[model samples]
Target: RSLLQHCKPFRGATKGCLRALAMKFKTTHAPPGDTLVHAGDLLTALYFISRGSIEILRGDVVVAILGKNDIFGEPLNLYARPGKSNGDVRALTYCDLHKIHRDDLLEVLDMYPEFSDHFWSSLEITFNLRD
Candidate 1:
């Protein structure tokens, strides 16, 4: 996989998944404190952090700092009532990321079941490593 070797969570992704992401997603960058998504956001996309780090703020408190190998954002609607963000994602540093649109990602996931497993497994890693 021609991938983010620094992002360890994706270490289990299938090659097909890697290629799909490489072909479909677009990487981006931002300065510190820039919000990637905010409260009340209707998510249509999510991001994979390839370099640097980001902060998750719930109201005024910094809840988490996610970095390389981390996945932020969500393509699935996570609103309490099918609307609004749970928190805000901010650039903690000069960030390097790639985004996957909801439709595109779901499409790819359907084609690769192993990647789907890996995707959710990686998400569990995100939650577990908060320590």
Candidate 2:
């Protein structure tokens, strides 16, 4: 998928790698204005945007708008180390996302050395860019 290709970890990956990952992800659909993640809610997975857009909200304030080719929940899942999500993610448009559970992701990292580097690099970039 185009969105997956844009992710630092998936970028330039071989077709076999992509296929393996695709098989590992679960697809999800969300309606417009739906809150995919709510503040203080535990996040068991990370989402890779495949279609539509989402707004990142901190409390009642909109902090960022993410469109196709974006990834969310990675930094929070990795860094915040929260028992739950600390912010909200609402669908701005009908959305199609690829969801990867944290445990599954960790398993992939253990299986693939390259994945850890890409995942951590992407997480670092996302955190550094957060306002």
TM-score versus the correct structure, for each prediction: 0.66, 0.66
Clash count, candidate 1: 3
Off by over 4 Å in 1: 1-15, 75-82, 122-131
**Overall lDDT per candidate, in order of appearance:** 0.63, 0.63
- lDDT string, candidate 2, 31-124, tens digits: 8878887777666666777768888777768776566556665544344442566577778999887767666676666677576676556533
Identify the runs in model 2 with alpha carbons over 4 angstroms from their true place. Answer: 1-14, 75-82, 115-131
Worst lDDT window (10 residues) for model 2? Answer: 122-131
Q: Model 2: what TM-score?
A: 0.66
Kindly give the stretch of ten consecutive residues in candidate 1 with the minimal lDDT sum. 122-131
What global local distance difference test value does model 2 have? 0.63
lDDT of 1 by residue, 1-131 (tens): 54434333455344567777677877788678688777677655666787788887777786775786666555453422223566777789988777667677777777776666545655642421111
